[PDB]
Short mmCIF file of C-alpha atoms and ligand atoms in Angstrom, two decimals:
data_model
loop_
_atom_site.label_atom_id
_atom_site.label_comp_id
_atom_site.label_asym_id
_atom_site.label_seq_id
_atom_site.Cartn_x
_atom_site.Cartn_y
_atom_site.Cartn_z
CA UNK A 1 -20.23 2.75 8.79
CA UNK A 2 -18.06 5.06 6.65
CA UNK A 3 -18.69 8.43 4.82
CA UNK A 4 -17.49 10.03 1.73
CA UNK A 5 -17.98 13.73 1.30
CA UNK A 6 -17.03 13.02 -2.75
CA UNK A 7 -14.46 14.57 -5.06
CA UNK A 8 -14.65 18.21 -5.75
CA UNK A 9 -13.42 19.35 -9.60
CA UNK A 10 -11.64 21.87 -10.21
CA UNK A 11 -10.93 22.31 -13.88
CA UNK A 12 -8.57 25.66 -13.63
CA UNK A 13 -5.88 22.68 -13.20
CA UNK A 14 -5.74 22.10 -16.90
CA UNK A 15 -4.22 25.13 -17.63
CA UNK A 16 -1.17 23.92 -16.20
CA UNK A 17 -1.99 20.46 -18.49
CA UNK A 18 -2.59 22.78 -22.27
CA UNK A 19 -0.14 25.11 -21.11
CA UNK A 20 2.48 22.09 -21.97
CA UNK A 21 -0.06 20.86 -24.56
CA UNK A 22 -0.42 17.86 -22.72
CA UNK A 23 -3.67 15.64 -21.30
CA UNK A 24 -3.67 14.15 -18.11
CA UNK A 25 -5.72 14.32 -14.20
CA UNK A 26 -4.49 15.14 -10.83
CA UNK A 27 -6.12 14.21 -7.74
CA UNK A 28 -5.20 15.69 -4.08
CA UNK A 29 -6.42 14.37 -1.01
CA UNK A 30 -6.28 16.61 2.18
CA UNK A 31 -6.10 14.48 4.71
CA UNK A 32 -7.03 16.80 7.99
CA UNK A 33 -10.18 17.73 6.13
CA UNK A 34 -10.44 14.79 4.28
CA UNK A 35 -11.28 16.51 1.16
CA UNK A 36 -10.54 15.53 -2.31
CA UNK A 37 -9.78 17.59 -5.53
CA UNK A 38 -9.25 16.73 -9.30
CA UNK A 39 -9.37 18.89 -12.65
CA UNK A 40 -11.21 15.40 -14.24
CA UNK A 41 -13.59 13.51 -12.35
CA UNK A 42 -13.60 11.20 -15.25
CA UNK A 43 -10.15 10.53 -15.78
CA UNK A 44 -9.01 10.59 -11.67
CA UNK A 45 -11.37 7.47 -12.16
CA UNK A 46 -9.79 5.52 -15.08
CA UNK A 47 -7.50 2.84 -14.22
CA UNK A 48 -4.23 2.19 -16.12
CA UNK A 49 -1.33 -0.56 -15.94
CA UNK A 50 0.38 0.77 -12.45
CA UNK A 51 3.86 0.25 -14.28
CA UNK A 52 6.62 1.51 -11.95
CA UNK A 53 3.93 2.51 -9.50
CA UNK A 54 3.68 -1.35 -9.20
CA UNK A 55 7.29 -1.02 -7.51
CA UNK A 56 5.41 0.20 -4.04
CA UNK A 57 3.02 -3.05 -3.26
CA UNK A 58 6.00 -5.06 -4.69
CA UNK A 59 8.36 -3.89 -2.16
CA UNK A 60 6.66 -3.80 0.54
CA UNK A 61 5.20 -8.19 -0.03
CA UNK A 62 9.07 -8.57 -1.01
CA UNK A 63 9.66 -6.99 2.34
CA UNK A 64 7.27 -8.83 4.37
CA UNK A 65 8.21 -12.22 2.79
CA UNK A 66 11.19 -11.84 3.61
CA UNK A 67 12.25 -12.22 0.06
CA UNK A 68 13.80 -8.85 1.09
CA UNK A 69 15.74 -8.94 4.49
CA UNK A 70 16.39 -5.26 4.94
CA UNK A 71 16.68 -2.20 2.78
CA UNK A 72 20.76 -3.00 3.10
CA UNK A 73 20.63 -5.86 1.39
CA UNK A 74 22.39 -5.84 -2.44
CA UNK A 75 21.02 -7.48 -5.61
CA UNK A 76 24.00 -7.68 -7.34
CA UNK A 77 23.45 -6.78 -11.42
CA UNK A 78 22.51 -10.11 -13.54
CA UNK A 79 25.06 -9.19 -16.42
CA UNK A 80 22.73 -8.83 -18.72
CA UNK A 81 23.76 -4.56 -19.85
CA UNK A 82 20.29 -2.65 -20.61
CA UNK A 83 19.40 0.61 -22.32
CA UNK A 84 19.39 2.14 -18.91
CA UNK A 85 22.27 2.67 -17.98
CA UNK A 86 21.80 3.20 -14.06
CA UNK A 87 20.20 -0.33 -13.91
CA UNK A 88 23.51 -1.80 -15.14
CA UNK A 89 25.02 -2.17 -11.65
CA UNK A 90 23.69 -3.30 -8.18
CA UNK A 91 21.28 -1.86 -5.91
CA UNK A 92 19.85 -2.01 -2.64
CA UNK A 93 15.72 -1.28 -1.75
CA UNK A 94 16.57 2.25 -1.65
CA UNK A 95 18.58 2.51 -5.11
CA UNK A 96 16.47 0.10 -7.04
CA UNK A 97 13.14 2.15 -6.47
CA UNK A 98 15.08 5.71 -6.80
CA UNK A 99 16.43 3.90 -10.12
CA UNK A 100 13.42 2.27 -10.83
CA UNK A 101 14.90 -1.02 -11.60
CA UNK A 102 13.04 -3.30 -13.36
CA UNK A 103 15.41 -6.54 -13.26
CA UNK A 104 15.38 -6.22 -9.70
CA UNK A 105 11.54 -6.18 -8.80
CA UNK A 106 11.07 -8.53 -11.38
CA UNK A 107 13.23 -11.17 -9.75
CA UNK A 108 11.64 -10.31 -6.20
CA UNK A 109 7.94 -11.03 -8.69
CA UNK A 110 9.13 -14.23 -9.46
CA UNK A 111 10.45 -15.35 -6.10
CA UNK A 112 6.96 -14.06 -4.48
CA UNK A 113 4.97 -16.20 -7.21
CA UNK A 114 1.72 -16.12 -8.65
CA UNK A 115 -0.44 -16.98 -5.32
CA UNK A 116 1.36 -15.27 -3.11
CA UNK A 117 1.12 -12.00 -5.54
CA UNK A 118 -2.35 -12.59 -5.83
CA UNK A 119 -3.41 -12.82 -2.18
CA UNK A 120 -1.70 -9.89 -1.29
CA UNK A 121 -3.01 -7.50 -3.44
CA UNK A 122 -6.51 -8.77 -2.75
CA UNK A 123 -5.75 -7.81 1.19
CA UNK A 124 -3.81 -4.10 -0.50
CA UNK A 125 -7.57 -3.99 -1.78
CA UNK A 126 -5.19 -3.04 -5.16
CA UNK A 127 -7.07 -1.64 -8.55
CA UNK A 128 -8.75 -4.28 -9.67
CA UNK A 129 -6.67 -7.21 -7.98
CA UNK A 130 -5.77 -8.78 -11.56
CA UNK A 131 -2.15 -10.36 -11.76
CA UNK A 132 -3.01 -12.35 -14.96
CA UNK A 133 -0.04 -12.83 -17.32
CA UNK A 134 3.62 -12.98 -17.25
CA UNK A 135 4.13 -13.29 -12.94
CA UNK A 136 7.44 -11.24 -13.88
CA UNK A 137 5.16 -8.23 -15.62
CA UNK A 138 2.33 -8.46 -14.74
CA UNK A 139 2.15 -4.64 -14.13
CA UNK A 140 3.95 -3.76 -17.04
CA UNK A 141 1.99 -5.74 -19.77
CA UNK A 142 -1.22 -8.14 -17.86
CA UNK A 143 -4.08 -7.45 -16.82
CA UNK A 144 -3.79 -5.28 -13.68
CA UNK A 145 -5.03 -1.10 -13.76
CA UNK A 146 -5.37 0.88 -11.26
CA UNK A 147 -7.17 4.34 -10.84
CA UNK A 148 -5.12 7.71 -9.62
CA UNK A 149 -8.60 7.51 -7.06
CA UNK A 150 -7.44 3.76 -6.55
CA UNK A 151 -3.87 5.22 -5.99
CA UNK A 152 -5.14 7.88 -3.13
CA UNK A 153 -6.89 4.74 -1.39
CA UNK A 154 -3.81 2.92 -0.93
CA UNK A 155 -1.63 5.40 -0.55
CA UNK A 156 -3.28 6.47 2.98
CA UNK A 157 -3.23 2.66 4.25
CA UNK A 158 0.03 2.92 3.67
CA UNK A 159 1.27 5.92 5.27
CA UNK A 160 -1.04 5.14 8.28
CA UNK A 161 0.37 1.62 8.88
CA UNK A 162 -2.61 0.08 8.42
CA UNK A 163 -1.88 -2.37 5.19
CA UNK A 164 -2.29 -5.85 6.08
CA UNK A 165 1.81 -6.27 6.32
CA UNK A 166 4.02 -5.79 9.11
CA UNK A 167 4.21 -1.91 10.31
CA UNK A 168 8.13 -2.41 9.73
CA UNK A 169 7.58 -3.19 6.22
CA UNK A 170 5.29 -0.27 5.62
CA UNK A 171 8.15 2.20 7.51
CA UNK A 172 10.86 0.64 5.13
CA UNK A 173 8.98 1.27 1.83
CA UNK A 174 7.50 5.17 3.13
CA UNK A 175 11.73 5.55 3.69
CA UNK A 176 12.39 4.10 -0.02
CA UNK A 177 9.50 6.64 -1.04
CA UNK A 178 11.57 9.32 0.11
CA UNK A 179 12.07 11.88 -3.10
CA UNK A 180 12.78 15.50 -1.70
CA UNK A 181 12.41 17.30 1.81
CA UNK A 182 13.55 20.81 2.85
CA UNK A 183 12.52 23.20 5.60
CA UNK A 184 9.10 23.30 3.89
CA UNK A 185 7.60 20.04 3.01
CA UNK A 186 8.70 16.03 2.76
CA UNK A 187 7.34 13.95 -0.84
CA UNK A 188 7.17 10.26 -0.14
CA UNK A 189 6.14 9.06 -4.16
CA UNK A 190 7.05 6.84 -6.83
CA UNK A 191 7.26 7.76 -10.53
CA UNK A 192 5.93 5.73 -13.30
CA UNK A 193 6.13 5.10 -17.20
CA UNK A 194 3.23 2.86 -18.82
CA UNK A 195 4.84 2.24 -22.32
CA UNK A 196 4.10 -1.62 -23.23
CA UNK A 197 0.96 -1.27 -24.17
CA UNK A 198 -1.07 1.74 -24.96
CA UNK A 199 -2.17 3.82 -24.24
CA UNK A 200 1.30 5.34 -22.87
CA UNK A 201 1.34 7.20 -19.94
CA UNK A 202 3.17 8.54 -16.82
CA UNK A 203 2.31 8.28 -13.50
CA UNK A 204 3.29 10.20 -10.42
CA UNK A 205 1.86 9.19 -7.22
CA UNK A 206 2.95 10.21 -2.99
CA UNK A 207 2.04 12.46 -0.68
CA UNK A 208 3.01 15.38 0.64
CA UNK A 209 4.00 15.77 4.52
CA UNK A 210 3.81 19.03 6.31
CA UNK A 211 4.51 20.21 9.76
CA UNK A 212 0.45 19.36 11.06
CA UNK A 213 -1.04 17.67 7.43
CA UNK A 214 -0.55 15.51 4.40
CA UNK A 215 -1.93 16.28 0.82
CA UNK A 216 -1.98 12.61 -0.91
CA UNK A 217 -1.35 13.16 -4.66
CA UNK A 218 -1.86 10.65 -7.57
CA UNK A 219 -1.48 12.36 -11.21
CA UNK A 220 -1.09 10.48 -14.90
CA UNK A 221 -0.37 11.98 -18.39
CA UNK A 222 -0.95 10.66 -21.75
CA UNK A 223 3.42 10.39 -22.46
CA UNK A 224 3.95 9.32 -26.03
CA UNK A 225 7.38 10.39 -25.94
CA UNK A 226 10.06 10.72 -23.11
CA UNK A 227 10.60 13.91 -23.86
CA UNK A 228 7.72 15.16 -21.68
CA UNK A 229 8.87 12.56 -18.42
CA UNK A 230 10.07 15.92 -16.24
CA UNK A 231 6.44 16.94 -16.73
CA UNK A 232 5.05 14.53 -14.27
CA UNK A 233 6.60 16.08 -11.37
CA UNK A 234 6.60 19.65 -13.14
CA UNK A 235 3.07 20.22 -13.91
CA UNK A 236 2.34 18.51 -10.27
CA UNK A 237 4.03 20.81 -7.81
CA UNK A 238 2.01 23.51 -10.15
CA UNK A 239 -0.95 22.26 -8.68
CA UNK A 240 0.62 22.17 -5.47
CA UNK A 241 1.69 25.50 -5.60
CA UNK A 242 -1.51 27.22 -6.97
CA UNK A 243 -3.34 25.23 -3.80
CA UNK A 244 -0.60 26.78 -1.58
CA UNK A 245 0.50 23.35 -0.32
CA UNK A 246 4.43 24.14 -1.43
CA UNK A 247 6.06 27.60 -1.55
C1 MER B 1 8.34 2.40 -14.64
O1 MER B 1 7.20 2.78 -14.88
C2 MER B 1 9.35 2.22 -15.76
C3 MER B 1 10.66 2.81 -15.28
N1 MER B 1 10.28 3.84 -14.33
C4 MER B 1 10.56 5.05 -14.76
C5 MER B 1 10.19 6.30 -13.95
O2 MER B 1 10.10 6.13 -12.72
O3 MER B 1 9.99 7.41 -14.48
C6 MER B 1 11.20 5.00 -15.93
S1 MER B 1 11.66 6.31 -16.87
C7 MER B 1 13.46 6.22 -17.13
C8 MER B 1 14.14 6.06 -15.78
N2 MER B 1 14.46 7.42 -15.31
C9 MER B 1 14.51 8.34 -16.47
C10 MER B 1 13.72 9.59 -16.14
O4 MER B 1 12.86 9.55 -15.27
N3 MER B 1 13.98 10.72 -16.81
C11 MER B 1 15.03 10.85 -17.82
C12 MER B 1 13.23 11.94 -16.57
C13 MER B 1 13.96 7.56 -17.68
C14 MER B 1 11.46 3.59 -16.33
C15 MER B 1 11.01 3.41 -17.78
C16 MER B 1 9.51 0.73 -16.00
C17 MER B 1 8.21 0.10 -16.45
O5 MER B 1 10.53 0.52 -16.99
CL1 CL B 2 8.58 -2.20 -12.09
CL1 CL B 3 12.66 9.01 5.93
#
């Protein structure tokens, strides 16, 4: 009924990994051809704790629960001031995922609750489907992982409408996605940071949208400090660029 053509490696990729010193996999997905590529077969296949990543299926059941009415709507800050400092002040949709604001998604977790949570990511067809633990972090410390392959998968339900939530919801999330667009190229991703339990990581994972294609990308890094965060993105459009996707 369906056909899979299979990942193709390409290991010249980890230069751009050791030339940081650093350890991690990239997958692309070229969606006209429907081709994919990754410099690890191996590791493109191991699932972490989504993290951030999380914040994508959690806005869009927020969304189409209407636990969030509109991307206008404010979620004024608790009070409570935390070590970053950008989450110390309200937000919207849009600001809360640019932000990455915890608080925020965890209070749309808790409103959604633990069947709700579970049932949806079961019809996302999400990593392994595992909410267990804390319903408020779940993705941050339980039992949930996902795969950068896993990623890809739901990545292109999303961007072609065809999750099992309202097309509306799925437009206002692939706007809240929105991270950079020039003349050249639009990235619709979301950034992540796995440091609760180990091993720690960062994720990056979008696509790509140009004039007639999209390049799906899902990419994770062993992290152990923040210093190396700006490498997520960095060592990405790399790849990008050495595939000729981005100028
Ligand atoms: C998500 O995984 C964690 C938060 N999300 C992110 C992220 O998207 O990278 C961070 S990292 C923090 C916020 N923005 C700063 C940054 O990206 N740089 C300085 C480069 C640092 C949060 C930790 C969530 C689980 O806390
Ligand atoms: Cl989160
Ligand atoms: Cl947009």
């Amino acid at each position: 009924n369906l056909y899979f053509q299979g990942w193709q490696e390409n290991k010249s990729w980890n230069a751009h990994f050791t030339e940081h010193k650093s350890q991690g996999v990239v997958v692309l997905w070229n969606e006209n051809k429907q081709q994919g590529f990754t410099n690890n077969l191996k590791r493109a296949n191991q699932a972490f704790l989504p993290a951030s990543t999380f914040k994508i299926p959690n806005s869009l059941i927020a969304l189409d629960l209407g636990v969030v009415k509109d991307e206008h709507q404010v979620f004024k800050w608790d009070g409570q001031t935390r070590d970053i400092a950008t989450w110390n002040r309200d937000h919207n949709l849009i600001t809360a995922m640019k932000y990455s604001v915890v608080p925020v998604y965890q209070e749309f977790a808790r409103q959604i609750g633990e069947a709700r949570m579970s049932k949806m990511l079961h019809a996302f067809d999400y990593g392994n489907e595992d909410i267990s633990g804390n319903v408020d972090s779940f993705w941050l410390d339980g039992g949930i992982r996902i795969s950068a392959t896993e990623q890809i998968s739901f990545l292109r339900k999303l961007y072609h409408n065809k999750l099992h939530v309202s097309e509306r919801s799925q437009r206002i999330v692939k706007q809240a996605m929105l991270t950079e667009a020039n003349g050249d190229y639009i990235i619709r991703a979301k950034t992540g940071y796995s440091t609760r339990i180990e091993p720690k990581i960062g994720w990056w994972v979008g696509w790509v949208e140009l004039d007639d294609n999209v390049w799906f990308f899902a990419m994770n890094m062993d992290m152990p400090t923040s210093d190396g965060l700006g490498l997520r993105q960095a060592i990405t459009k790399e790849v990008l660029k050495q595939e000729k996707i981005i100028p």
